[PDB]
Design a protein around this ligand. Structure first.
Ligand code: NA
Ligand code: NA
Lengths: 208, 209
């Protein structure tokens, strides 16, 4: 019998992302109660508030990017931009959301959120993730261009985007890429990648 | 037609649902502190944040081992597993009676015992006691969680999940954990057994050890 290896890997990734702002809330509350750290009262309160914001943003994004079913549902592209903006708020790269306000089907919506976060993670020293999406020729086509110093799609991300098993690398970046590949291919669509100097692009289309 | 990540999405939906409850309470608590109209409830809002942060920390530490662990060989201290399971029971009406003698437990036993203990807590809608037993014998590690309390019940989606059956009547949340447990126990070469009585429900599992 096949184990829940893939679901465990996704669970491990989500825990890892949530534990960082959650433990900071615990540590911030520790500092408020500590009589020795009464000089950092304002800094501890700002740590709790920023970690609560980060955690709320990550959970709201996860809800649609990973928690959504494959059942038919339309999403507002403006609401999806809010979710992507939320995760980009706590990382060094900036977001250039160029999708004109419109209704997006479920595969398009799940795909655009995962593509935007993979583009952000391709930027280790900042830069810009440009997100484009057009409804044309019976498809919804997405392209996220990550431009910045040493922009790179890691080998486990490239393996995941092709639906290949995890070889060299961490499960965390691989599992999101493999999840995106499986939902796009289940919808009858395709994933494409572009790699250049200080640039990486992730493209996907789904029927629409 | 290609297979979608439907099962992984269901597990992700379940984890979000569990974490969003104490996380939104932290946001609401911080909203009350900043609200000039609610300056008379500063103490109550701070207690809401602190208790929700404790609940969230406990849920995340448990999830890390119950759902996030790989199938790779690793031993866990049963005392550390007790702390994780107790953290889950701390914020619900049922109580946990952990009767596993302090010992080393392999990856399948550890993952299984944590899921069984939480399924036992959820089988108690009006409180009671979940007794968790675990013995290393005959080349096996055998776990039994007995949930005893008023109207103790294993929901149909939990019974379907524990047998490795698809989701029929019920919610994905309780089904996905039960199906996850079934898949990790059967991958390890073990078996799951259930007992249902009046105001009692038991979940048993064995894995090779
Ligand atoms: Na940013
Ligand atoms: Na309790």
């Amino acid at each position: 019998v096949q184990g829940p290896d893939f679901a465990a890997m996704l669970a491990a990734r989500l825990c890892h992302d949530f534990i960082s702002p959650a433990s900071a809330i615990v540590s911030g509350l520790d500092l408020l109660e500590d009589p020795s750290a009464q000089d950092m009262r304002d800094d501890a309160m700002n740590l709790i508030a920023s970690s609560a914001r980060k955690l709320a943003d990550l959970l709201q994004f996860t809800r649609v990017a990973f928690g959504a079913s494959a059942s038919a549902e339309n999403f507002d592209s403006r609401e999806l931009e809010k979710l992507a903006q939320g995760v980009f708020a706590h990382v060094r790269p900036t977001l250039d959301w160029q999708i004109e306000p419109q209704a997006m089907n479920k595969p398009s919506s799940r795909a655009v959120l995962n593509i935007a976060q993979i583009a952000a993670s391709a930027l280790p020293a900042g830069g810009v993730a440009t997100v484009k999406g057009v409804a044309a020729d019976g498809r919804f086509s997405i392209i996220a261009d990550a431009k910045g110093p040493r922009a790179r799609l890691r080998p486990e991300v490239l393996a995941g985007l092709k639906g290949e098993p995890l070889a060299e690398g961490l499960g965390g970046p691989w599992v999101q890429a493999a999840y995106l590949n499986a939902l796009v291919r289940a919808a009858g669509g395709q994933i494409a990648v572009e790699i250049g100097e200080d640039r990486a692009s992730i493209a996907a289309w789904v029927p629409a």
